[PDB]
Every structure is written in structure tokens, then in C-alpha cells.
Amino acid sequence: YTANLAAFLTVERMVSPIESAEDLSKQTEIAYGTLDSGSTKEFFRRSKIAVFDKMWTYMRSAEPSVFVRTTAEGVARVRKSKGKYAYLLESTMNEYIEQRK
Amino acid sequence: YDKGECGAKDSGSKEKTSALSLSNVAGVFYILVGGLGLAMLVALIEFCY
């Protein structure tokens, strides 16, 4: 009994996911995606950075589709995925939804 | 690999699952009821001798 209790404490003591772009690209439980047509998706397409090209090749072939039609659907999916989904977008719109109910 | 669903990072320590089981609980019981039935196989011979 005392042996099983210490395992779960250490798994969560790992504190995941940490805040970064690569930690989001390293695990696939909590999936992630962007917008279908816009300056956000085209960013990862022609990115010659190893960390970002990895994120592109994931989402370019991530199934089910991690993309969305509009931005209103993207915020609604992060809420109903129980934290198993993340959304990438500009920092401006990201900071206004955090300050709206 | 890239088009693969089970990605090369899906097996690279992706998740840390954990849950206690009763899987091997038997082994311990697997030796005491054999003693509860043995302490009972030797007890009934001391209340008569």
C-alpha cells in the first residue's frame, strides 16, 4: 500500500505540461492545432526551425483534424476537451479570452 | 513515421500511466488460507490430545 501511493505523487510532481512550445510538441495526449487559413497556419508551413517544423509535420498529419474553421470554435474546444487539447493563436486574442468569462 | 498515427514520439515516453491493481493480490492469500486451513488441520488435534 505504501509502495503504490508514492508512484502517483511523483507522476504529477513532474508537473506536465510545463509552459513552452516544445513541451506542447513532445506529448500527444493533449493535442494542439491552429486555424485552417491564416497567418498562423502558414507560419509553420515554411518554418525552417526544428522545433516548429516538428509541430507542422504533426498537425499537417494529425488525425483527427486539430484545425478549426473559425476562432470561436477553437476556444470552445479547449474548454470541452478536459485539458486534452490546446490552441495556438496570436497573443492579443489569447489575452482577451482569458479576461472574459 | 511522419504519417504514422502511433508517432515516433507516441512511444518515446509520451504518457506516464499509473493505477494500482489487484493483479497479484492472490500470492499473499495464496499462502495464508493454506495456513488457516493448516492451523485448522493442526488445531483440531490439540483440543483432543
XYZ file of C-alpha atoms in Angstrom:
150
model
C 0.000 0.000 0.000
C 2.734 2.465 0.962
C 4.529 1.469 -2.259
C 1.657 2.340 -4.604
C 0.981 5.734 -3.000
C 4.393 7.189 -3.923
C 4.051 6.459 -7.654
C 1.150 8.826 -8.347
C 2.725 11.620 -6.300
C 5.850 11.516 -8.486
C 3.978 11.383 -11.813
C 2.175 14.634 -11.017
C 5.305 16.053 -9.370
C 6.698 16.043 -12.915
C 4.289 18.981 -13.445
C 3.052 18.497 -17.004
C 2.529 20.223 -19.261
C 5.109 22.884 -18.462
C 4.724 26.174 -20.334
C 6.742 26.049 -23.577
C 6.380 25.402 -27.298
C 8.382 22.162 -27.293
C 6.603 20.532 -24.337
C 3.462 21.015 -26.417
C 5.276 19.353 -29.342
C 6.716 16.480 -27.270
C 3.486 14.899 -25.981
C 0.372 13.976 -27.948
C -2.236 13.292 -25.245
C -3.126 16.979 -25.050
C -3.273 17.609 -28.795
C -2.913 21.029 -30.403
C -3.779 22.861 -33.603
C -4.315 26.266 -35.171
C -6.583 27.926 -37.751
C -7.255 26.481 -41.191
C -6.419 29.513 -43.364
C -4.499 32.464 -41.974
C -1.158 33.878 -40.935
C -0.973 31.288 -38.137
C -1.008 28.088 -40.208
C 1.260 29.484 -42.932
C 3.788 30.240 -40.177
C 4.592 26.573 -39.523
C 4.462 25.644 -43.224
C 7.615 27.446 -44.396
C 9.324 27.483 -40.982
C 12.907 26.197 -41.194
C 13.175 25.790 -37.398
C 13.499 22.276 -35.990
C 11.046 22.841 -33.130
C 8.359 24.426 -35.315
C 8.770 22.162 -38.356
C 8.123 19.284 -35.949
C 4.873 20.956 -34.875
C 3.857 21.471 -38.513
C 4.528 17.868 -39.548
C 2.460 16.756 -36.556
C -0.579 18.919 -37.303
C -0.259 18.526 -41.087
C -0.871 14.800 -40.486
C -2.598 14.837 -37.078
C -5.811 12.808 -37.048
C -8.472 13.641 -36.095
C -8.023 17.130 -37.547
C -6.565 19.543 -34.994
C -7.572 22.545 -37.132
C -10.804 24.555 -36.941
C -12.908 26.742 -39.220
C -13.185 29.882 -37.066
C -11.679 31.163 -33.824
C -14.917 30.862 -31.830
C -14.817 27.085 -32.322
C -11.196 26.885 -31.172
C -11.838 28.435 -27.765
C -14.880 26.174 -27.355
C -12.765 23.048 -27.933
C -10.099 23.849 -25.323
C -12.956 24.083 -22.811
C -14.676 20.765 -23.614
C -11.513 18.657 -24.026
C -10.930 18.491 -20.234
C -7.478 19.924 -20.886
C -6.647 17.278 -23.514
C -6.421 19.954 -26.226
C -4.600 23.251 -26.747
C -4.985 26.090 -29.239
C -2.382 28.317 -30.894
C -3.152 31.892 -31.963
C -1.931 35.471 -31.652
C -1.151 36.707 -28.151
C -3.653 39.580 -28.393
C -6.792 37.469 -28.811
C -5.408 34.915 -26.341
C -5.208 37.509 -23.552
C -8.764 38.797 -24.067
C -10.431 35.386 -23.757
C -8.551 34.759 -20.504
C -10.171 38.000 -19.267
C -13.674 37.056 -20.472
C -15.902 34.567 -18.681
C 6.989 7.711 -39.336
C 5.607 11.202 -40.044
C 2.284 9.964 -41.445
C 2.164 7.364 -38.665
C -0.601 7.676 -36.091
C 1.417 5.982 -33.328
C 4.076 8.634 -33.776
C 7.764 8.123 -33.110
C 7.186 10.303 -30.030
C 3.985 8.462 -29.073
C 6.275 5.607 -27.975
C 9.061 7.917 -26.785
C 7.755 8.108 -23.205
C 4.632 10.028 -24.205
C 2.382 9.217 -21.229
C 3.052 8.122 -17.639
C 0.093 5.910 -16.768
C -0.411 4.619 -13.242
C -3.085 2.649 -11.370
C -2.888 0.068 -8.582
C -4.269 -3.369 -9.438
C -5.380 -6.464 -7.549
C -3.439 -8.401 -10.201
C -1.030 -10.134 -7.817
C -3.050 -9.940 -4.581
C -3.586 -13.715 -4.761
C 0.021 -14.713 -3.976
C -0.313 -13.450 -0.419
C -3.724 -15.004 0.186
C -2.204 -17.939 -1.755
C -0.341 -18.995 1.395
C -2.389 -17.952 4.438
C -5.692 -19.765 3.875
C -3.436 -22.734 3.247
C -2.297 -21.851 6.767
C -5.770 -21.048 8.058
C -6.748 -24.472 6.741
C -3.490 -25.860 8.141
C -3.730 -24.147 11.520
C -7.213 -25.681 11.433
C -5.702 -29.015 10.381
C -3.440 -28.920 13.453
C -5.821 -27.161 15.887
C -8.401 -29.965 15.937
C -5.610 -32.336 17.055
C -4.795 -30.306 20.191
C -8.339 -29.994 21.597
C -8.454 -33.804 21.906
C -4.923 -34.958 22.834
